[PDB]
Design a protein around this nucleic acid. Structure first.
Ligand SMILES: [K+]
Ligand SMILES: [K+]
Ligand SMILES: [K+]
Ligand SMILES: [K+]
Ligand SMILES: [Mg+2]
Ligand SMILES: [Mg+2]
Ligand SMILES: [Mg+2]
Ligand SMILES: [Mg+2]
Ligand SMILES: [Mg+2]
Ligand SMILES: [Mg+2]
Ligand SMILES: [Mg+2]
Ligand SMILES: [Mg+2]
Ligand SMILES: [Mg+2]
Ligand SMILES: [Mg+2]
Ligand SMILES: [Mg+2]
Ligand SMILES: [Mg+2]
Ligand SMILES: [Mg+2]
Ligand SMILES: [Mg+2]
Ligand SMILES: [Mg+2]
Ligand SMILES: [Mg+2]
Ligand SMILES: [Mg+2]
Ligand SMILES: [Mg+2]
Ligand SMILES: [Mg+2]
Ligand SMILES: [Mg+2]
Ligand SMILES: [Mg+2]
Ligand SMILES: [Mg+2]
Ligand SMILES: [Mg+2]
Ligand SMILES: [Mg+2]
Ligand SMILES: [Mg+2]
Ligand SMILES: [Mg+2]
Ligand SMILES: [Mg+2]
Ligand SMILES: [Mg+2]
Ligand SMILES: [Mg+2]
Ligand SMILES: [Zn+2]
Lengths: 115, 219, 305, 154, 110
RNA sequence: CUCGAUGUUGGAUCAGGACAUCCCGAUGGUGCAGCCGCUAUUAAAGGUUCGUUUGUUCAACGAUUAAAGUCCUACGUGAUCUGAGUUCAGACCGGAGUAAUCCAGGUCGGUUUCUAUCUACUUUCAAAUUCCUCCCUGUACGAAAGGACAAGAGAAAUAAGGCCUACUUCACAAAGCGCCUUCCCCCGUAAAUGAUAUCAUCUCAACUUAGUAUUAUACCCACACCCACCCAAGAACAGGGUUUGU
RNA sequence: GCUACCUAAGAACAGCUAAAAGAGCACACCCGUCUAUGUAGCAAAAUAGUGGGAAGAUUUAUAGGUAGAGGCGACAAACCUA
């Protein structure tokens, strides 16, 4: 769904993600051997001239049945350890992400709405 | 008589026995889960078991924008805007994880497909998740909502103005100029509607299906 | 010297009569074989490690989804056994191979369209001709008397099978569709070179190696899908629900056999041996056999509690 | 690959195909028997059969009238369809036309066929007739039939 | 790509006289019982078909004279009546196309 | 050798081969505790990334990877493609020359034909590789820090072969972006018993064990109804069906 | 009788903007940017689309003039009957 050069939308409230910039956030690497990122995959972003890792929490490409499809490509900025940069995610995120609480426990804690 | 669209098989060389045995499974599932009558444009609330949700149950309310598939695999797509984020879920009618399908508002729209709502203003895709079901009177004609939506500026996901789509529920006069509408007419195929050999008559197929449905209800 | 066909010289009155006559004989011949165990059956030996039993010939009806109790979706292929009978038995000595063989045929066809040699073979067998005949390697203890009918309940849910059939024929195809070649760019000056093979060899050898990938006929050859799980058996219609997809088009004839994969070796201890005899069966099997993990159509909705 | 493609590719494209077929169908309604290349007659035969069904709906059915208006380029034939052809087949549910192969066309050796609406007033085509019931083979089978019927009643 | 060498008549004869290139004998030719001329089993007799077409053309020319113009198709059925015949009870209300010749034997009145 | 012509860089396409092995396998040594390394023996089945600038091969850099191997094949491959460069005719700059013109320099522009006669080839039908997660385990190891192997479980990517239930492009069907299946080994050494040489010694001593496949099995297999029609079979031919020949 | 330049006397240039125009948009008309096709071709230089100009140093019909040690040239060593 989300590959290199794909422009993404940061759905968290981090300052890095919401500050105005002349270039939109863009994917420059997907941490998957096939280079195609789906919900739950980490990607590298070129955002405000910096390199920051992000977690995909939604995309427009149809997925398996019974899974939500969003009108935008949504990502959440995280650190290398997996900690979220922001403190609140207002945009709804799929419940399927809760299968990955082992590694994404803190990111889920800041998610207000699930779909 | 409403025959759910998944019961009418698509034209092809499939052996009729395959459709007969598939209908036995659809009817056996229909007596465990009540699948109500609904159309594209109706507001539904679907409850499904989810292993990772809170309470192991999930509820989603949205407008039905597409009905597709045949047999056990038939599906429908619900659309809604939650916190400004448009979301769609393609539900499987006969998937055993579905607990309930509730028709919040039963109605039809000017089009058999509302995929163009993705390119309309968000207001036309926004429905309160806690809206109360509106009662449907007995033996009344299904209400046809003649709402024509206003579209966002081009480009759109698809060329909704092209004749092949045959969309009647869009305010084209507001969003498109006269020259743009004339260009779209270059793709018109006036001979298509009169091509008799393309007509697919399901009258006899539907009549036989109704007999199989009635037999199951007796046993 | 001019060619002839069955109803060339028949009058308006005789064409309906002949059709009805031959049709009834076919039905009578098939009904006479429904009691194999009462017609001097061969010895029924017990299953032993290393034993190989016969397979089936089935028609591919189509595909259908089913869900497991864990919520996962599995698509399956419906295979209907249509008039499957054992035709010939060849002993290990006469086979010219390491094992004995048992010939099986499936699906009745018109006698007016078969060669004379084939018709006299079926005349002696007392069965109408079959569309497809396949040869199954078996052990001596698995031999079955020619003329014995075979049913879908020959297999049981939980078993793994191999399905062999002719793939869909796509005719003469280029390298891109046939072999997955990348082709050449759409623009930037390509001159009449977009879907072509490119270089086919090096200049040194001054030839093309045998087996080089080139344009040619695609599909319409025998392929085998291994390790397909049997999810469900419908004994009334004699249909096998097999996991995934099988080669060939819908309504084609497929060869069904026990899976030969090493992981599934010696799993026939609980399977019917040498085959399933519904007449012999003491208790009639239910209309549907289900694997333990399959959600039956009438079961309550899944709940994760 | 053309699996399951039921329509032929003729004329200058999809539209021209319909117009080519429409001209053949219009000529058939007027003359009730025409000859044309075998493939084109075979393709048009399907439309010629369905046209009668629309004619049976009646001239008061607006959908039937629109269909007839399109497929009949000569408007004097629309009354004929509804008042002559459709009543003639009132007691039939199909098989309104018969198509037979005729000798190849002289100029280009094209395979040719003649198609006509059954029940026309024109001289009858030399239809292929089955062998008489009095032939040697048919008499041997008649005896076999007689015998079987006698054995069943007993 | 041009021929590197001339092809011999020996090679050319093998290509030209190959059984694939030869004309195949037809085994579906039979005599027409009505006229005696030859016909193919699956094709109508050429001689008989031409005879039917000649009569069909004559009748059609008569229909034209009665119609007397374009876009004048009748709304009633038609019956061809030859010399020495009159309309039957079933021929009432049908346009009568009169042919100035004796009814052909193969053409049966109905 | 070839100037009565063997078309000249890099790239695209498709790759055949070598092993002097980049990764994966198996071993000896270590200044090898462990985790990582270094070096050597054996191994060519399988694999060996995507981008910014540059015509570039290279190189630098960004982000990755189990790894981003070295070579040969007319510096593989233009009767398959590309023409940015180089290398005609126009032009400008610097320099040389009295000038015409010139420059291992730079710069902008600049026509890439071929209908295949022969050789070869056009289903080597079917055994698959790798990473990661969990677990083992915070165990072996170690002062601590740090931190495995084997076994087992799951989940993926790629490759090969198929398929259309749903999704998607679509709509009697063909497709992927979707789904399904995928099964053996490989030899370097490590060890016993035991002579020549009455100890010892794994032995181009007789011999024993790790240690091996007659690669297993699978697939295919009956064929003067056949004029004609239909087809999921197909360029033609062939093949399947017609008990569907008004 | 092509083409370069010239001489005599002719012809053509919609619509819109500006209203002043070797001005802009844009037909006819003239030219030939880029790509594909074509390459014994429809064509010994073309076709399709895309383009420059289109009241001017414009385009164009007719007749005449300049001739090879030459002509003519808004110099490309252009053009002077493929
Ligand atoms: K040379
Ligand atoms: K040669
Ligand atoms: K020694
Ligand atoms: K031309
Ligand atoms: Mg910067
Ligand atoms: Mg789109
Ligand atoms: Mg095919
Ligand atoms: Mg491509
Ligand atoms: Mg070219
Ligand atoms: Mg091209
Ligand atoms: Mg044509
Ligand atoms: Mg030479
Ligand atoms: Mg290679
Ligand atoms: Mg080596
Ligand atoms: Mg390799
Ligand atoms: Mg080279
Ligand atoms: Mg070329
Ligand atoms: Mg070459
Ligand atoms: Mg160049
Ligand atoms: Mg200078
Ligand atoms: Mg240059
Ligand atoms: Mg240029
Ligand atoms: Mg060629
Ligand atoms: Mg481990
Ligand atoms: Mg010792
Ligand atoms: Mg000793
Ligand atoms: Mg003047
Ligand atoms: Mg003007
Ligand atoms: Mg101007
Ligand atoms: Mg201008
Ligand atoms: Mg001189
Ligand atoms: Mg100059
Ligand atoms: Mg010069
Ligand atoms: Zn005749």
């Amino acid at each position: 769904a989300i590959q290199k050069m794909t422009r993404v939308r940061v759905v968290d409230n981090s300052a890095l993600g919401n500050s105005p910039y002349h270039r939109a956030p863009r994917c420059i690497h997907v941490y998957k051997k096939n280079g195609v990122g789906k919900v739950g995959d980490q990607i590298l972003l070129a955002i405000k001239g910096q390199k920051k890792k992000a977690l995909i929490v939604g995309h427009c490409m149809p997925g398996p049945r019974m899974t939500p499809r969003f009108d935008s490509n949504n990502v959440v900025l995280i650190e290398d350890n997996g900690n979220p940069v922001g403190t609140r995610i207002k945009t709804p995120i799929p419940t399927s992400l809760r299968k990955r609480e082992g590694e994404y426990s803190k990111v889920l804690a800041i998610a207000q709405n699930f779909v | 008589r409403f025959l759910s669209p998944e019961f009418i098989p698509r034209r092809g060389r499939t052996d009729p026995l395959k459709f007969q045995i598939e209908r036995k499974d659809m009817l056996e599932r229909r007596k465990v889960l009540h699948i109500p009558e609904f159309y594209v444009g109706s507001i539904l609330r679907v409850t499904t078991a989810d292993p990772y949700a809170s309470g192991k149950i999930s509820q989603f309310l949205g407008i039905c924008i597409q009905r597709s598939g045949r047999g056990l695999g038939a599906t429908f797509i619900l659309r809604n805007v939650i916190e400004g984020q448009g979301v769609e879920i393609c539900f499987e009618l006969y998937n055993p994880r579905v607990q309930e399908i509730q028709v919040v508002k039963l109605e039809k729209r000017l089009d058999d497909s509302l995929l163009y709502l993705r390119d309309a203003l968000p207001e036309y895709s926004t429905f309160d998740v806690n809206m109360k079901p509106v009662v449907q009177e007995p033996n009344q004609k299904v209400p046809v909502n003649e709402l024509k939506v206003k579209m966002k500026p081009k480009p759109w996901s698809k060329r909704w103005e092209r004749p092949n789509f045959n969309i009647k529920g869009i305010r084209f006069d507001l969003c498109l100029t006269e020259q743009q509408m004339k260009e779209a007419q270059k793709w018109n195929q006036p001979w298509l509607e009169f091509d008799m050999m393309r007509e697919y008559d399901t009258s006899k197929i539907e009549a036989a299906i109704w007999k199989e449905i009635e037999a199951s209800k007796r046993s | 010297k001019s060619g002839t066909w069955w109803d060339e010289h028949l009058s308006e009155e005789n064409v309906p009569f002949i059709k009805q006559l031959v049709s009834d004989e076919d039905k009578a011949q098939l009904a006479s074989k429904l009691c194999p165990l009462k017609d001097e059956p061969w010895p029924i030996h017990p299953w032993e490690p290393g034993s190989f039993r016969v397979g089936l010939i089935a028609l591919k009806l189509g595909m259908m989804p089913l869900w497991t109790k864990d919520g996962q979706k599995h698509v399956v292929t419906l295979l209907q056994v249509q008039d499957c009978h054992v035709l010939k038995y060849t002993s290990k000595e006469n086979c010219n191979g390491k094992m004995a063989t048992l010939s099986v045929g499936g699906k009745t066809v018109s006698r007016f369209r078969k060669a004379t040699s084939i018709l006299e073979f079926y005349r002696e067998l007392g069965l109408p001709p079959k569309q497809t005949v396949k040869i199954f390697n078996i052990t001596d203890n698995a031999a079955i008397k020619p003329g014995t009918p075979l049913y879908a309940a020959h297999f049981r849910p939980g078993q793994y099978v191999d399905v062999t059939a002719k793939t869909i024929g796509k005719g003469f195809q280029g390298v891109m569709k046939r072999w997955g070649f990348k082709g050449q760019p759409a623009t930037h000056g390509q001159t009449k070179t977009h879907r072509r093979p490119g270089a086919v060899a090096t200049g040194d050898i001054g030839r093309v190696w045998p087996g080089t990938k080139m344009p040619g006929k695609m599909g319409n050859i025998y392929r085998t899908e291994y390790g397909l799980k049997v999810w469900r058996i419908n004994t009334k219609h004699n249909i096998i629900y097999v996991n995934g997809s099988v080669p060939g088009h819908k309504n084609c004839l497929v060869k069904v056999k026990d899976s030969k994969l090493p992981a599934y070796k010696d799993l026939g201890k609980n399977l019917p041996f040498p085959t399933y005899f519904p007449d012999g069966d003491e208790e009639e099997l239910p209309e549907d056999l289900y694997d333990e993990n399959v959600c039956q159509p009438g079961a309550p909705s899944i709940t994760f509690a | 690959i053309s699996h399951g493609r039921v329509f032929r590719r003729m004329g200058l494209g999809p539209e021209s195909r319909i117009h080519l077929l429409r001209n053949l169908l219009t000529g058939l309604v007027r003359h009730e028997r025409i000859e044309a290349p075998w493939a084109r007659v075979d393709e048009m035969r399907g439309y010629a059969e369905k046209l009668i069904d629309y004619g049976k709906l009646g001239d008061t059915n607006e959908r039937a009238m629109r269909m007839a208006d399109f497929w009949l380029t000569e408007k004097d034939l629309i009354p004929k369809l509804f008042q002559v052809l459709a009543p003639r087949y009132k007691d039939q549910t199909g098989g309104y036309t018969r198509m037979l192969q005729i000798p190849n066309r002289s100029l280009d050796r094209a395979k040719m066929a003649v198609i006509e609406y059954k029940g026309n007033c024109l001289p009858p085509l030399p239809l292929p007739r089955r062998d008489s019931h009095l032939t040697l083979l048919n008499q041997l089978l008649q005896g076999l039939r007689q015998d079987l019927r006698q054995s069943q009643e007993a | 790509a041009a021929p590197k060498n001339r092809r011999t008549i020996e090679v050319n004869r093998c290509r030209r006289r190959n059984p694939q290139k030869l004309i195949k004998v037809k085994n579906n030719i039979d005599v027409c019982p009505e006229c005696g001329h030859l016909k193919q089993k699956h094709v109508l007799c050429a001689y008989c078909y031409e005879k039917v077409c000649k009569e069909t053309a004559e009748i059609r020319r008569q229909i034209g004279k009665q119609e007397g113009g374009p876009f004048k198709a009748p709304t009633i059925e038609t019956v061809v009546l030859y010399t020495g015949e009159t309309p039957s009870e079933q021929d009432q209300g049908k346009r009568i196309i009169e042919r100035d010749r004796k009814r052909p034997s193969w053409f049966t009145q109905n």
